[PDB]
Amino acid sequence: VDTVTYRPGAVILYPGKSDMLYRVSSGLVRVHTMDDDGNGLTLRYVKPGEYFGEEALAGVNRAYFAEAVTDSAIDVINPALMSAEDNLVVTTHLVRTLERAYESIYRLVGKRLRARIAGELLELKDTALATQLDSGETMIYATHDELAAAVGSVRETVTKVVGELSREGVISAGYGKITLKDERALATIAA
Amino acid sequence: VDTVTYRPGAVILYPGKSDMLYRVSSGLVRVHTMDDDGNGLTLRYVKPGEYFGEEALAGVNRAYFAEAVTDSAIDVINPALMSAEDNLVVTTHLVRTLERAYESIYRLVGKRLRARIAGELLELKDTALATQLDSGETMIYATHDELAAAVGSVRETVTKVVGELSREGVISAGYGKITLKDERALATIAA
Ligand SMILES: [K+]
Ligand SMILES: [K+]
Ligand SMILES: [K+]
Ligand SMILES: [K+]
Ligand SMILES: [K+]
Ligand SMILES: [K+]
């Protein structure tokens, strides 16, 4: 139906009653909440082609926020107007999204923070937060606070681990930027 | 289509290629995996009326196990044979299941173990693991190892917390059984 643009950091959906279905056409969206200390917790990143606000399909309310991470173009969809073919597409996306939620759970319980940090950097490599340097390396735009929210940690501990991974030579750390110097080694650490 | 019965502890689905869609008609199923130490991790309990094995809809493989917790009757469904009306039902269930996955994440990151244990007992109150004593209290059949897998902890720490909640007078602990003596107080602890 209609496409709306949002600037970085703008809220798309607040917790409350459901309404329409949304799809990322371009950019990057973050579904998140707050913990009991006010610290953020990212539930998932939503890449182009992926849907959010699906609670509209079930009429259930939404308990999360959705915000634009980068400049983003979002398509707004009416669930009733959708055709059966489109419904199959959304269903396929939901299955994949639930599979990613279960992987997030497994990793929260079963992986050390360095493994979670390494996996998250590789995930962000295929998003709008990533750019290719002249060296050919991938650089990710993320602060240590944004990483902490994505892996369920706190800034201070993420900073320590970024320091360790820099000393191991697998990343080069910057100011709100992290260059992936050895993506094979990152995959090994992440597993 | 067809309905199959499984005894307690029997494996319904192994990790591998997807096939059919499954629904619990009676009983209780557990979707789970193993961590890096061999310890179990429950992803969710599946109650009567709820679906599992949805990866069949998307043709993706399954990375989890599904097992019968109690004596259970499971309906096997062919995704292609399904009608559009049935597809809407499964889609609604998926949305709710994803909402429960996100709540699981939030609680793993943001809640202390006593809060997670208390919330889980109240969740199991409406399952086949629950029975009503003559006193009117609800009793749950669960070992401390089964609780640890449901809240992402280890047995030894769950045992300590069960001891604390017993001394606070909110449960009465038994051998593979826990009686909910004060469900209001449990809800307060869980929040
Ligand atoms: K750790
Ligand atoms: K930073
Ligand atoms: K390592
Ligand atoms: K704790
Ligand atoms: K026990
Ligand atoms: K408390």
Numbering used by the authors:
A (entry chain A), B (entry chain A): 12 to 202
Copy text verbatim from the article accompanying this structure deposition:
While the asymmetric unit contains one DdrI monomer, two neighboring molecules form a dimer, consistent with its dimerization in solution. The final model, which comprises 7 α-helices and 12 β-strands, contains two domains: a nucleotide-binding N-terminal domain (NDB, residues 13–94) and a DNA-binding C-terminal domain (DBD, residues 122–202). These two domains are interconnected by a long linker α-helix (C-helix; residues 95–121). Importantly, the linker C-helix in the DdrI structure is fully folded, in contrast to the partial folding of this region in ecCRP in the absence of cAMP. Thus, the fully folded C-helix of apo DdrI led us to suspect that our DdrI without cAMP binding represents the active CRP form. Instead of interacting with the adenine base as its ecCRP equivalent does, Arg55 of DdrI forms hydrogen bonds with both Tyr113n and Glu65, leading to insufficient space for cAMP accommodation.
The cAMP receptor proteins (CRPs) play a critical role in bacterial environmental adaptation by regulating global gene expression levels via cAMP binding. Here, we report the structure of DdrI, a CRP family protein from Deinococcus radiodurans. Combined with biochemical, kinetic, and molecular dynamics simulations analyses, our results indicate that DdrI adopts a DNA-binding conformation in the absence of cAMP and can form stable complexes with the target DNA sequence of classical CRPs.
